[PDB]
């Protein structure tokens, strides 16, 4: 509590910045009020980062290649440019898939043009074209190529769309140029937008004239689920027990065929609004497919979401939804009975990219754990509109929080657990606070659905109540 104390803390933390930086950062920190529904009057988001403040944000290339296009398994993605970006982003994201890597799936491989000085000075369009030739030569079972641009490509004026068009015409193949230069935008959000536009322009509408696929009144498409540690699978099976048919899965364990078949579905289930609201809205306008957001974090949210999805279909789907809820009730009830006493009253601070800082709150509350603060790397004001009603009063909200800011807020608030990325993990572990990676699930998972709830509770208990956190002080100190 003590909203005034939180405001004083914000002021004290901000005191160290220079005038311009302090003025900019004052607008990105706020004290939550659930009655307020217009976050623009409360916080600002999706703005440029202050130079030299150790931000956690990424680039548009990370949002396009690493997030949207990367999980697509039957496609070959070329990191057009120098060698660093593909190497740093290679297999760093646990978007699970099923396939023979190197033969029919290529997610964990690094394809790059490996730009040198000659490619910078004289261009790389010829290199790109003959690279596409080598790609078709060595990987005959690929079902398409995407070309993700890096910073020099935008800087040196390489004309990649023309090359993609010509080579795709000559090989009768889908070649998708994506202009995801890292300097575009302020974070991965513009990467998401550019990737969505590329999907719309070059992939989505290829089967508009094809009326062969058989359709059923129960066709749904899972949008924005990237199968981290398997989450999408743990969701899909539930949708399979409700009587629905999941035609498409974007983009984790996703195939270009699923993307092509998506316009034939009857409903879109958007998990990550932030990354794929653009494509969902475009599908709504062009094909008339309705879409809804859903949440499978914790028993309460997953039950509510399943009922909401069942409401958009006939009575048989509703009966099957009630059956699946009844079938899965004892499992999560037992999980709660085992783990809630071990976690009652523990306070959490979160800092994740654009969806999870609000989607995971229900799961924490299902174990009797309250979130005293959240924030986003790159979310927009609509995301804050959504999360401000999901937190308690006088809770901290931060947008593009810096390392010093986040460290000071933790030193004052002193939560029992922190969920953020790898770049805060060891910082906060060395300060004696349990930490969980909320991007990669700390190499565990899935956390979605009834099956994921058990893993989530077990991980939270094993980290919160670990003996290691009681041994940071030497007995002689």
């Amino acid at each position: 509590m003590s909203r005034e104390e939180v405001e004083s803390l914000i002021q004290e933390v901000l005191e160290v910045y220079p005038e311009k930086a302090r003025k900019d950062r004052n607008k990105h920190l706020a004290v939550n009020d659930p009655a307020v529904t217009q976050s623009k009057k409360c916080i600002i988001s999706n703005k440029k980062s202050q130079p030299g403040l150790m931000t956690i944000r990424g680039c548009a290339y990370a949002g396009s290649k690493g997030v949207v296009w990367g999980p697509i398994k039957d496609m070959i993605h070329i990191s057009h440019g120098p060698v660093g970006c593909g190497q740093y982003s290679r297999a760093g994201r646990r978007n699970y898939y099923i396939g023979t890597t190197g033969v029919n799936a290529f997610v964990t491989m690094n394809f790059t043009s490996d730009f040198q000085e000659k490619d910078i000075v004289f261009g790389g369009d010829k290199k790109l074209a003959k690279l596409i030739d080598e790609v078709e030569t060595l990987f005959p079972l690929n079902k398409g190529i995407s070309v993700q641009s890096e910073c020099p490509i935008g800087l040196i004026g390489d004309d990649i769309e023309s090359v993609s068009k010509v080579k795709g015409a000559e090989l009768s193949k889908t070649i998708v140029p994506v202009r995801c230069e890292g300097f575009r935008g302020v974070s991965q959000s513009l990467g998401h937008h550019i990737a969505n536009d590329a999907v719309r322009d070059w992939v989505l509408g290829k089967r508009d004239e094809d009326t062969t696929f058989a359709s059923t009144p129960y066709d749904v498409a899972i949008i924005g689920d990237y199968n981290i540690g398997g989450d999408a699978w743990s969701s899909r099976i539930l949708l399979e027990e409700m009587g629905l048919r999941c035609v498409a899965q974007w983009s984790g364990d996703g195939s270009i065929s699923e993307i092509e078949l998506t316009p034939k579905v009857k409903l879109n289930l958007v998990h990550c609004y932030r990354s794929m609201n653009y494509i969902s809205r475009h599908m709504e306008e062009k094909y008339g497919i309705p879409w809804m957001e859903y949440n499978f974090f914790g028993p309460t949210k997953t039950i509510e979401s399943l009922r909401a999805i069942a409401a958009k279909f006939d009575e048989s789907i509703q009966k099957k939804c009630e059956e699946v809820i009844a079938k899965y009730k004892p499992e999560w009830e037992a999980v709660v009975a085992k783990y809630r006493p071990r976690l009652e009253g523990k306070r959490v601070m979160l800092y994740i990219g654009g969806l999870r800082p609000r989607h995971v709150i229900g799961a924490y509350e299902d174990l009797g754990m309250e979130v005293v603060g959240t924030g986003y790397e790159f979310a927009h004001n609509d995301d804050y509109d959504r999360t401000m009603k999901e937190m308690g009063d006088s809770t901290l909200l931060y947008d593009d929080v810096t390392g010093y800011e986040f460290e000071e807020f933790v030193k004052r608030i002193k939560p029992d657990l922190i969920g953020s990325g790898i770049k805060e993990k060891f910082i906060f572990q060395k300060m004696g606070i349990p930490f969980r990676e909320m991007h990669s699930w700390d190499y565990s998972g899935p956390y979605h659905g009834f099956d994921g709830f058990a893993i989530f509770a077990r991980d939270m208990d094993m980290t919160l109540n670990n003996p290691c956190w009681k041994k940071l002080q030497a007995p002689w100190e």
């Binding site: 548009a60 760093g92 890597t101 910078i120 060595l138 899909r236 065929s257 499992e331 060891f426």
Partner: protein, 522 residues
């Protein structure tokens, strides 16, 4: 479904019958997956020699590279100085990736800032970004020195680091006395080791170039050690310990061992230890400068010989027996300090280990990859043990390094089957290990996938991987190990011989089939 008493993670939860059925339904319905026989045929074709020729005909496509870009090495070099903040001029995605890479390797906090240049900077340059970033960084994180490197954006748009920093100083954004060394690190040139070299040359030039008048060679009775791009803390520790044992005064420039190995005692230390500015300033007074990894410290060598007037010895990386011996002789000759009995005893202990393990190490075939100095030292050590390096790969090596490695190989009968590849990637290595199968691979974590591919061909075709190098992501605390000196040689020998013995034990565990050779004593 889940059992509350035995909760399963992704493995083995997704091998349950319902999950398998749902996955098969998805694949059969909406994937249009190629038939399994086609997939197997294509994989088998990728395991052949014709595919290897088609793969080696590559000129434009790089698949699974084994190198990073210059600013990564620049950041690693900058982290080795006291209270020094690495500052990469350009985009922030690069800094996020660098921090993620170093965090996943070292499992330690890594501090680095950027000025977050955007399209506006692409149109009008990044001078304002540099000024604001320097001011904000100094005000917030309070570093004693800011070491500036560059991303490719700034290099392509041609941002002038000197002019930007000078104007930032003159306009009062930072104090004029504040040290801000800079280095240009184009990612389209060389690799991370070149970035380390450029950053070190920039820092040394900043701290020395204008103060050469009062410098006398050999005045402070010390020897300068330049480690280069090093990701094993044990190597810094072993070099320091060996020089302290010999009674030799030394100044280890760019020492990051403390900031990458901070204790967990309830407080976060952003800065810890590191080379001091006084050490940098007094470096020209040393007797001589020794570069531990000379094959990526050419610019530093040029600057030291040209400016400091130091006769830098021609020494290889102190890896193995002979090269460590040569390094010790050279340091003793420069310093006048005789080699003590402790180092002789350690060397004899290493020789005893070699004599113990020679029967298991002899004749083994290895495909190894990594950085040039590391690769050549590993090849030398493998030739010392009677092993046979077969596929030597260095993506960021050059023709002179290839000629040196060929000269090393031609000096031993165990190098008659050795071929050195430069400019090749890990897909080339996959083809090589499929066509000319070695006993083991040596390299970073990226080789694990290659092993998986081999295991798909068959158990008799599997090539086990030995994780020595950078980066190691799938194992914990291997970065604390040592690769230099007699201690490093002992660690490598133990790891190799135990890998051989573990593979032999696995191959002979079949009961009533292959367990006649499951010996208790090996």
């Amino acid at each position: 479904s889940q059992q509350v008493d035995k909760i399963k993670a992704s493995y083995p939860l997704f091998l349950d019958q319902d999950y398998k059925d749902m996955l098969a339904k998805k694949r059969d319905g909406f994937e249009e997956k190629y038939p399994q026989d086609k997939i197997d045929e294509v994989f088998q074709w990728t395991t052949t020699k014709e595919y290897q020729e088609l793969n080696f005909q590559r000129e434009a496509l790089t698949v699974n590279p084994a190198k990073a870009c210059q600013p990564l090495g620049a950041v690693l070099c900058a982290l080795g100085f006291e209270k020094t903040m690495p500052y990469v001029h350009g985009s922030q995605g690069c800094v996020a990736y660098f921090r993620s890479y170093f965090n996943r390797h070292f499992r330690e906090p890594v501090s680095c800032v950027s000025d977050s240049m955007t399209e506006d900077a692409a149109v009008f340059g990044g001078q304002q970004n540099m000024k604001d970033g320097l001011q904000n960084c100094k005000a917030t994180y309070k570093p004693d020195m800011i070491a500036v490197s560059t991303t490719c954006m700034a290099e392509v748009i041609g941002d002038d680091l000197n002019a930007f920093i000078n104007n930032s100083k003159k306009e009062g954004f930072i104090p004029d006395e504040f040290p801000v060394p800079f280095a240009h690190t184009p990612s389209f040139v060389g690799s991370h080791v070149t970035g380390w070299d450029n950053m070190f040359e920039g820092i040394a030039r900043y701290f020395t170039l204008k103060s050469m008048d009062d410098k006398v060679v050999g005045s402070n009775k010390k020897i300068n050690i330049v480690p280069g791009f090093e990701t094993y803390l044990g190597n810094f520790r072993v070099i320091k310990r060996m020089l302290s044992e010999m009674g030799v005064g030394y100044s280890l420039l760019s020492d990051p061992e403390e900031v990458l190995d901070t204790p967990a005692d309830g407080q976060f230390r952003m800065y810890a230890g590191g080379t001091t500015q006084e050490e940098m300033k007094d470096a020209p007074n040393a007797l001589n400068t020794v570069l531990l990894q000379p094959w990526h410290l050419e610019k530093t060598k040029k600057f030291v010989e040209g400016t400091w007037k130091h006769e830098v010895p021609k020494l290889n990386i102190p890896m193995g027996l002979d090269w460590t011996d040569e390094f010790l002789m050279k340091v003793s000759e420069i310093s006048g300090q005789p080699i003590p009995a402790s180092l002789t005893k350690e060397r004899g202990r290493l020789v005893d280990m070699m004599t113990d393990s020679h029967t298991w190490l002899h004749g083994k075939r290895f495909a190894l990859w990594g950085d040039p100095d590391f690769v050549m030292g590993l090849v030398k050590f493998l030739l010392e043990l009677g092993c046979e390096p077969v596929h030597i790969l260095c993506h960021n090596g050059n023709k002179r390094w290839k000629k040196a490695v060929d000269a090393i190989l031609a000096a031993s009968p165990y190098g008659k089957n050795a071929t050195v590849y430069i400019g090749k990637d890990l897909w080339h290595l996959r083809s090589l290990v499929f066509t000319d199968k070695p006993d083991f691979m040596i390299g970073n974590s990226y080789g694990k996938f290659i092993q998986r591919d081999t295991l798909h061909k068959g158990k008799e075709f599997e090539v086990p991987l030995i994780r020595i190098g950078f980066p190691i992501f799938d194992r914990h605390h291997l970065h604390r190990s040592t690769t230099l000196g007699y201690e490093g040689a002992m660690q490598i020998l133990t790891t190799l011989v135990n890998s051989i013995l573990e593979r032999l034990d696995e191959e002979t565990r079949g009961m009533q089939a292959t367990d006649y050779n499951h010996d208790l004593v090996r």
